[PDB]
């Protein structure tokens, strides 16, 4: 501090400079500096930086700045200064006005961000409340000015140094709104105080909109950002042509300040409470900002898109230099101003905006997910404004998606995106954060019915339970426990629909692969208890009598989904399918009307007649008769009709000749006119069967498309995407020759129909239910958790008190036993079910299903008996499960159609039960006054009461005594009540 | 950094980033911008890399570094803005703060701010008066 | 744009005046001749005179434009009769019993823009309805005085009395209406004093 | 930030978690603003007196020319370094540190004596003559002009040296300051006045809000008081207190050099410069009790608001009166000239409004008696514009035009006083002293309203907004004597300076219908006062005969009417009649008067 004092009072040079700089990188250096900056402001550093900056501006002050290297690190200095402290700050701040004056010494030069006297008064008012009130209006006022002669005049030195010469300052321009936004916006909250002068100053001056906003003929936002991005891609108006350094990027210039300008007047937006409350300050300056940008404009720049990195040949990525072109910030801003001064309140202008200017960028952002290409300035970016600013205007618009049912497709491609995006490596933590709260509020406020496809691809990713698997996991906890009635209730929830039995067979393989990864797994604390309530949830959305169809959908949706690349185009094959002599007559009459449709539409088009085959005189198709169409002409039709036949026959589906349009179209200077075909209908099934063979075509056209890519050795083309994730227009065309081929098929009527039926009608349902099925688990790991405690009891007494079974120890005390107890909680009534009605659904349990739930009980008990301290705070848990099964427990039709080792399993519970009473009789008797009599006693006072008490008031409450106790089970009663 | 570093933990800070010294400038290069706080202790991650690198002519001095401690000051923000009330309050540690325990906690020392709690509780209200200490705080120190 | 609304209700139909200059100030008493600059409180928009188009035009635009306010009448109005500038009125010729009108009945401007003296209902009809305009603009409401040229605009016809050697009374329009052949007086007396 | 704040202190820590240094700094700095600054020693006396003591001339042995004293070495060095030619007046610590010095020893400062207040005055006169005898009234002069009307700490403390050498209206120091101005034919300080006006700050609504939103936002203010609201008040009255201790004592000469400079090159009025300031601290209170006409209750940053701009106006309005007085013909043309009517308007309404809302609240009391106090001064000054007035007279005139203007918030000011003029007959009526039968002088409220509905003088809305007035009581009863002594002793000074302001304008303007309709309006306000009020005729120093109005209290009337004083008179009348002289019968009359 001593040599920058001393260097004070010598004129500043070149080696005064180096030595000033040398001081101050060695202050900024120590450690007292940071640690005790009362010290240094009382030291007065501060005012000695400013002193030095003010000799150095009055230096040559009509020239340029001599020394802009001192005057450079003399700003990065205060900056810092005012970024110790916020006393500091305030000090600094008693220095705005000169650095007002001074705030255009260096800003069109660039390598100067943050070393200016803007930025030094920005310093010396960022995040500060009382600092920002502070500001005065002529302080905002000398920065306006500014503002207005920079959009209005060029820059001197940019145009001296051999730069177009536009008619404005875009550059300077950017900085001076930046630091109009650190004015106007502080810690998260707009100062309406300031943003009210800050929006009137700026109306008053419009040149400071820039050439277009300015209005009397200049042209939209949207095209001043086209046509700077033309600029930006066209050389020879970007830069000079006689570390950006010389390089200014003029088109990224302008861009940046027309998206500085919009984010600022979004920060001066008022803020919906005062709106809502009626402050006509707030609606006039809404109303001036709605004026100035319309809604247009903003629409347009968010569907602009950007220029993805390309993989090359020999693996080398190319990344467009990000300062050169458009950037993901720019649109940003544009989010920001739409969200603050108009916002989304109408379903239909969210589902357009979503459709048209923000699913395009997530659909990019998922397609960069390679390992190479996801490490990329644009990849990183994109993710950065996605998880910044689109995800949480979705997230706070989530209410507006309850009814979109119409818009199915491009909601199921926003989800499939988002999952994908989810799913993608180098993502931060927040980022990843933002995704699952977005992913998970959209996907509440959908309808159950209609997320079926986001349903299938977890299927086949969540079992893995790696770590990514908690988002699905919380995702379909909270879908079933929401959406329950949709599928375990008949009717359904309502209005929404019933299962189609698809979902119920993916619900089925959902659950039991959940159920085995999560036995075959090394217990985890948190995976567990994220994943029990899933499989509790599941459990109880699924109906207990459900029946699993032996037969799955031939080429059910696993074909298109890949593992770990999650794409694979699987076209059916189409050498062994050899197509009827019978429907040649279709081909024919097929192309006929294809002739005769294309014929009509190049007319339309109005093209040159076809009077001969001309090739450079494009004379080409002739519109001749087909019957006068040579045969070669004929393949171009023929051909995609014997491939549509081919998959046709290779999907099992029959086509049957119908007799009467059969022999009724056999009885049955050019004029291309054809068919209005577009009228006709069709059934629930015949739309399936088009959106599936729609699907093998976009599948075969992307499998194409993608040998083509790895011949031209990389890239990523848009559309390059699974069938569910494309978008409705994107489906459009493959949709609309679907309903072509099915209508030609319907017209001519020849039937089609689903061809391969079920093998057996499956009446067993007492051996294929679902409920069967994991009762069976169920008992059968009771089973081997029992064989388990009985080797404890061998082991442990002797030496093993470590037993090397821990794994499925804590496997069946944490996820069984609350399975067990949420499952029979939620469908007592079904168990319970009898020739009675005490469910109206039809329930009805089976006899066989009744016997096990015996069993389980018989079993739970059996492992219960004087184990309670084994398995410590579990106790609870078991003495719940059997609570719970006591109650469900149909003792009357067990008894009367049951096997004979169920029911003396049964009768022997309450004999032991009987036995541990007489044997806590004589532990009590003679013990009152003076070791295993504790562990009877409390053994019995925490678990056989309850079981007993629970079973004997479900036993009373059915009337089950008159059916259940008779003969040895009375005599162990009469033990029991003594 | 605005006074709220303690001057022991910032003078370690300073040690570490002397271990390769070198003017402030020298042998603290992006290369050595993760080594300096590996040997400082705590682990940078990618994306504690990608805060370091956010903002940052190439090669970074004490101020920027120690800049970049104060975003990364974030980190490390869970128990001990909750260990001073649970160390002044709540002896039993249940959380369900008692009726009257509520009404010292909320009676206004100095500040004597008025119609922020009759808002809170307008905004959101417990129900079983019974007002939650936990659901009551998280809701700032989110 | 800038128009006419029925309600007062709102902050639409309000405009501050503010000075065009220094030599006034806010709470400063306004006088007769000044520049104002109006502000909506609506739209905070100014007063405003384009040249956008090929005519000119006024809109509530940013850039302000200095508007000077002329008086015209005043609430002195000289209660009772006291005919002022601007006045709608019929001329009575004789004993209360014939109005200065045109023919209408005929149909057709051609005869229309003869002036004649007529009886009857003519008196109410709007047939028979001049009104007075004073050649100056500044003060036009004010009373009108012996002596004082004005110029008779037939209220229907929107056509102005006027007098050539010819064909002496005549209606012409606006575009005709040259104060050398439209300009009259009342005299007290008919004597060339 | 709210969050921030409450994390903040969450984990903020007392002193025995800090580092001892870091306690130690805090205590240093503590110390200081607490004890170090708050001392206090009182040295300035005794320093100027051994300053300005001669030293040792019969060492000094010279006995040709008495040798400068070093106060008179050191005011000739201020006044040297004020008098060389500079584009600014730089910061001087030293001559700031000793102007204050000065100052202090001049002021050096329950009913005393007359010989105690004259050994005051005596001791208040020596202790200025000390300054002025060396050049200290010259010095400031000097800074003023110097200071080119930049507002600024030496310009505060040359405006207390000047007020502390000018206190009491000295003479002497007045006519050494028109001396010096006149023989230095000096427009510098004139523009120099002329630019510390226009420079004087005045109430800002926009600061004021401001900082309310800071204030809600929660953090305290490390540093002092918001003073950004009127930004020196302080600096303000001092130079309108010391332009009015210029002219005090009816200085005709310098009351009119004030207005214009004949001498000088070039003329500044500072007479409409100190209106202009008036016209803007009214336009300023003006908004700031718009801001709270909405409002129920006033916070205590805008009754120290409203506190500061009143004791501001207040100083203005007395220095009109110094300007006006004597009277000063020119400063009352220029003053009927000026935007003086526009300030008295905007003020009737403020006083007009105000005094209903602060009557109808308690915790406004205080602001209230300023207002009304404010209110007082500026009808002092009305009635010095009228003095020396003429029949239909321009200023009676205009006066008059400016009364029509205002008539509604002058007839509720009427109201208001005729209200709390009858407040007082109430209370010492019979049938009050029946209500509260015993002499403990406190009553209930419906007691008090059953009081007033018995004289039927009051109405019912007039009954209500007293009651209103009425403080809430746990007991539900009211102080009267408290409560007269609240609101009547205001009025029957206030509403009495009305009473002669518009006597005076009756008799000036005898030919005028409005002025006869404004006074049926006030009848009842005159006829209260119509026998306090007394008139009488002299033979004006303008050669011409002026009308005198002054006030006549109850105890004197009672003494005059005494039957012991009209034998008196009798026999005086009797004397001068029969065997007195018509050379000396005003002298007879005087000595009458005075043994009467």
Request: a negative charge; one cysteine or more; aromatic letters at 8%.
């Amino acid at each position: 501090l001593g040599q920058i004092r001393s260097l004070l009072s010598v004129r500043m040079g070149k080696e005064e400079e180096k030595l000033m700089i040398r001081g101050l990188g060695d202050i900024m250096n120590n450690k007292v500096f940071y640690q005790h900056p009362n010290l240094m402001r009382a030291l007065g550093m501060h005012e000695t930086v400013m002193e030095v900056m003010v000799n150095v501006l009055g230096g040559g002050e009509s020239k340029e700045i001599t020394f802009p290297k001192m005057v450079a690190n003399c700003c990065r200095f205060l900056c810092y200064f005012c970024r110790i402290s916020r006393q500091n700050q305030k000090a600094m701040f008693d220095h705005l006005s000169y650095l007002l004056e001074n705030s255009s010494v260096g800003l069109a030069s660039p390598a100067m961000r943050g070393s200016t006297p803007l930025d030094v008064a920005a310093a010396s008012v960022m995040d500060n409340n009382e600092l920002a009130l502070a500001l005065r209006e002529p302080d905002l006022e000398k920065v306006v000015r500014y503002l207005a002669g920079c959009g209005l005049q060029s820059c001197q030195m940019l145009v001296s140094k051999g730069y177009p010469d536009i008619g404005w300052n875009p550059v300077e321009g950017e900085r001076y709104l930046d630091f109009l936004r650190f004015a106007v916006f502080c810690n998260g909250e707009s100062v309406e105080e300031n943003a009210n002068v800050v929006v009137r100053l700026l109306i008053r001056r419009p040149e400071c909109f820039g050439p277009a906003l300015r209005g009397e003929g200049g042209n939209g936002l949207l095209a001043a950002m086209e046509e700077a991005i033309k600029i930006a891609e066209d050389p020879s108006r970007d830069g000079p042509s006689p570390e950006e350094d010389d390089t200014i990027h003029m088109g990224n210039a302008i861009m940046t300040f027309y998206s500085a300008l919009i984010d600022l007047l979004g920060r001066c937006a008022p803020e919906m409470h005062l709106i809502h409350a009626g402050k006509g300050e707030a609606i006039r300056i809404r109303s001036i900002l709605r004026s100035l940008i319309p809604l247009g404009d903003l629409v347009g720049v968010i569907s602009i898109a950007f220029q993805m990195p390309t993989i090359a040949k020999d693996g080398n990525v190319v990344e467009p230099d990000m300062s050169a072109g458009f950037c993901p910030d720019h649109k940003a801003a544009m989010v920001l101003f739409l969200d603050s001064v108009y916002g989304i309140e109408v379903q239909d202008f969210l589902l357009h905006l979503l459709e048209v200017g923000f699913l395009p960028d997530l659909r990019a952002a998922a397609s960069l997910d390679t390992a190479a290409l996801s490490a990329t300035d644009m990849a990183l970016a994109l993710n950065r404004y996605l998880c910044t600013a689109v995800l949480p205007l979705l997230t706070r618009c989530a209410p507006l998606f309850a009814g979109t049912e119409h818009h199915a497709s491009l909601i199921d491609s926003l989800l499939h995106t988002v999952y994908r995006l989810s799913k993608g490596c180098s993502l931060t933590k927040a980022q990843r954060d933002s995704i699952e709260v977005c992913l998970l509020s959209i996907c509440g406020q959908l309808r159950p019915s209609m997320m079926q496809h986001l349903l299938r691809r977890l299927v086949f990713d969540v079992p893995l339970l790696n770590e990514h698997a908690k988002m699905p996991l919380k995702l379909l906890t909270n879908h079933y426990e929401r959406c329950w009635k949709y599928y375990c209730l008949p009717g359904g929830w309502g209005n929404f629909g019933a299962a189609s039995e698809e979902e119920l067979h993916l619900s089925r393989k959902l659950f039991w692969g959940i159920f085995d990864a999560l036995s075959q797994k090394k217990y985890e604390q948190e995976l567990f208890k994220l994943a029990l309530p899933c499989l509790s949830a599941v459990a109880g959305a699924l109906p207990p009598d459900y029946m699993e169809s032996n037969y799955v959908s031939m080429m059910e949706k696993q074909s298109s989904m890949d593992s770990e690349g999650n794409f694979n185009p699987q076209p059916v094959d189409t050498s062994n399918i050899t197509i009827p002599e019978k429907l040649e007559y279709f081909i024919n009459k097929y192309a006929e009307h294809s002739h005769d449709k294309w014929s009509m539409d190049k007319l339309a088009n109005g093209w040159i007649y076809g009077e001969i085959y001309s090739d450079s005189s494009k004379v080409q198709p002739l519109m001749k008769p087909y019957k006068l169409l040579s045969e070669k002409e004929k393949e171009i039709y023929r051909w995609p009709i014997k491939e549509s036949l081919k998959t046709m026959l290779a999907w099992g589906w029959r086509i049957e000749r119908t007799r009467e349009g059969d022999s009724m179209a056999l009885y049955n200077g050019y004029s291309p006119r054809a068919i209005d075909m577009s009228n006709v209908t069709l059934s629930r099934d015949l739309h399936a069967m088009a959106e599936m063979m729609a699907e093998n075509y976009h599948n075969i056209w992307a499998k194409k498309k993608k040998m083509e890519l790895e011949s031209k050795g990389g890239g990523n083309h848009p559309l390059l995407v699974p069938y569910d994730t494309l978008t409705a227009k994107e489906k459009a065309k493959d949709r609309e020759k679907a309903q072509d081929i099915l209508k030609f098929l319907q017209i001519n009527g020849y039937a089609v129909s689903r061809g391969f039926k079920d093998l057996e009608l499956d009446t067993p349902s007492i051996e294929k239910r679902f409920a069967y099925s994991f009762l069976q688990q169920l008992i059968r790991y009771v089973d081997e958790a029992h064989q388990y405690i009985l080797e404890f009891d061998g082991g442990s007494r002797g030496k093993g008190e470590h037993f090397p079974y821990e794994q499925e120890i804590k496997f069946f005390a944490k996820v069984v036993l609350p399975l067990i107890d949420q499952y029979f909680k939620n469908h007592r009534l079904y168990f319970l079910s009898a020739a009675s009605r005490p469910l109206c659904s039809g329930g009805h349990a089976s006899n066989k299903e009744k016997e096990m739930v015996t069993s389980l009980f018989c079993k739970l008990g059996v492992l219960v008996r004087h184990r309670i301290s084994l398995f410590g705070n579990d106790a609870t848990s078991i003495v719940n499960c059997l609570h719970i099964l006591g109650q469900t427990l149909d003792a009357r039709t067990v008894m009367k159609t049951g096997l004979e080792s169920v029911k003396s399993a049964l009768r022997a519970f309450l004999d032991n039960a009987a036995e541990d009473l007489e044997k806590t009789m004589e532990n009590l008797k003679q013990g009152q006054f003076t070791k295993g009599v504790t562990q009877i006693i409390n053994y019995t006072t925490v678990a056989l009461l309850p079981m007993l008490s629970s079973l004997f008031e479900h036993i009373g409450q059915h009337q089950f005594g008159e059916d259940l106790i008779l003969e040895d089970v009375q005599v162990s009663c009469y033990r029991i009540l003594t | 950094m605005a006074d709220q570093l303690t001057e022991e933990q910032i003078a370690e800070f300073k040690e570490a980033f002397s271990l390769f010294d070198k003017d402030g400038d020298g042998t603290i290069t992006t290369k050595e911008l993760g080594t300096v706080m590996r040997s400082l202790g705590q682990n940078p991650t990618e994306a504690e890399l990608q805060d370091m690198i956010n903002e940052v002519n190439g090669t970074i001095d004490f101020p920027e570094f120690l800049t970049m401690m104060a975003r990364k000051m974030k980190d490390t923000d869970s128990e001990e803005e909750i260990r001073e009330a649970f160390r002044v309050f709540d002896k039993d540690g249940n959380g369900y703060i008692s009726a009257a325990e509520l009404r010292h906690v909320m009676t206004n020392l100095g500040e004597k701010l008025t119609d922020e709690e009759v808002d809170e509780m307008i905004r959101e209200a417990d129900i079983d008066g019974q007002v939650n200490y936990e659901e009551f705080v998280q809701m700032m120190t989110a | 744009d800038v128009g006419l609304q029925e309600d007062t209700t709102g902050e639409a139909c309000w405009w501050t005046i503010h000075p065009a200059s220094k030599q006034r100030s806010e709470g400063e008493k306004v006088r007769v001749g000044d520049d104002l600059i109006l502000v909506s409180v609506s739209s905070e928009r100014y007063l405003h005179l384009s040249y956008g188009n090929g005519s000119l035009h006024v809109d509530a635009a940013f850039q302000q434009t200095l508007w000077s306010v002329a008086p015209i009448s005043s609430g002195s109005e000289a209660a009772q009769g006291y005919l002022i500038g601007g006045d709608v009125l019929r001329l009575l010729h004789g004993h209360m019993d014939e109005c200065l009108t045109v023919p209408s009945g005929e149909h057709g401007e051609e005869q229309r823009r003869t002036v004649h003296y007529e009886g009857g209902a003519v008196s109410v009809h709007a047939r028979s309805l001049w009104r007075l305009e004073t050649l100056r603009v500044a003060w036009s409401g004010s009373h009108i005085r012996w002596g004082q040229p004005f110029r008779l605009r037939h209220v229907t016809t929107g056509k102005y009395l006027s007098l050539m050697e010819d064909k002496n009374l005549l209606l012409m329009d606006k575009e005709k209406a040259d104060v050398k052949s439209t300009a009259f007086t009342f005299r007290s007396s008919k004597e060339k004093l | 930030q709210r969050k921030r704040a409450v994390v903040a202190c969450f984990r903020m820590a007392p002193l025995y978690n800090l580092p001892r240094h870091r306690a130690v700094n805090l205590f240093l700095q503590g110390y200081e603003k607490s004890w170090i600054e708050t001392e206090e020693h009182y040295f300035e006396d005794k320093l100027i007196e051994d300053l300005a003591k001669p030293g040792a001339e019969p060492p000094e042995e010279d006995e040709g020319t008495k040798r400068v004293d070093p106060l008179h070495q050191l005011i000739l060095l201020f006044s040297r370094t004020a008098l060389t030619e500079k584009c600014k007046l730089e910061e001087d610590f030293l001559y700031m540190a000793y102007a204050d010095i000065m100052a202090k020893s001049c002021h050096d400062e329950e009913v005393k004596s007359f010989e105690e207040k004259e050994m005051e005055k005596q001791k208040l006169l020596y202790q200025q003559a000390r300054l002025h005898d060396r050049g200290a009234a010259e010095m400031v002069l000097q800074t003023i002009s110097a200071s080119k009307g930049e507002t600024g700490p030496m310009v505060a403390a040359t405006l207390k040296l000047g007020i502390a050498i000018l206190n009491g209206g000295n003479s002497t120091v007045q006519q050494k300051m028109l001396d010096y101005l006149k023989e230095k034919k000096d427009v510098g300080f004139f523009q120099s006045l002329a630019g510390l006006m226009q420079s004087c700050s005045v109430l800002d609504l926009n600061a004021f809000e401001r900082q309310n939103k800071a204030e809600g936002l929660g953090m305290v203010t490390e540093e002092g008081s918001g003073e950004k609201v009127l930004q020196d008040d302080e600096f303000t009255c001092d130079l309108f207190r010391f332009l009015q201790l210029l002219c005090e004592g009816h200085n005709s000469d310098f009351q009119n050099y004030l207005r214009t400079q004949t001498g000088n090159n070039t003329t500044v009025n500072i007479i409409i410069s100190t209106v202009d300031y008036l016209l803007r601290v009214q336009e300023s209170i003006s908004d700031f009790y718009w801001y709270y006409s909405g409002k129920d209750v006033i916070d205590e940053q805008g009754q120290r608001n409203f506190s500061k701009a009143i004791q501001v106006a207040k100083q203005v309005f007395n220095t009109l009166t110094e300007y006006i007085q004597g009277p000063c013909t020119g400063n009352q043309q220029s003053l009927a000239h000026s935007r003086l009517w526009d300030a008295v308007v905007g003020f009737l309404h403020v006083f007009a409004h105000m005094q209903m809302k602060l009557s109808q609240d308690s915790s406004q009391i205080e602001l209230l008696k300023e207002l009304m106090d404010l209110q007082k001064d500026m009808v002092v000054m009305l009635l010095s514009m009228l003095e020396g007035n003429v029949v239909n007279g321009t200023i009676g005139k205009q006066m008059v035009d400016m009364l029509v203007e205002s008539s509604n918030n002058v007839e509720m000011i009427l109201k208001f006083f005729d209200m709390f003029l009858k407040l007082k007959d109430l209370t010492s009526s019979d049938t009050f002293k029946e209500y509260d039968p015993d002499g403990k002088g406190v009553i209930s409220k419906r007691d008090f309203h059953k009081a007033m509905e018995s004289h039927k003088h009051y109405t019912q809305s007039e009954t209500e907004f007293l009651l209103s007035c009425a403080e809430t009581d746990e007991n539900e009863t009211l102080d009267y004597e408290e409560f007269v002594k609240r609101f009547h002793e205001p009025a029957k000074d206030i509403g009495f300076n009305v009473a002669v302001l518009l006597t005076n304008l009756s008799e000036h303007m005898p030919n005028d219908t409005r002025l006869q309709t404004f006074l049926e309006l006030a009848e009842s306000v005159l006829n209260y006062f119509q026998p306090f009020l007394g008139r009488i005729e002299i033979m004006g120093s303008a050669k011409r005969i002026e009308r005198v109005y002054f006030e006549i209290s109850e105890s004197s009337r009672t003494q005059w009417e005494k039957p012991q004083v009209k034998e008196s008179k009798r026999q005086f009348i009797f004397d001068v009649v029969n065997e007195g002289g018509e050379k000396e019968k005003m002298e007879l009359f005087v000595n009458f008067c005075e043994d009467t």
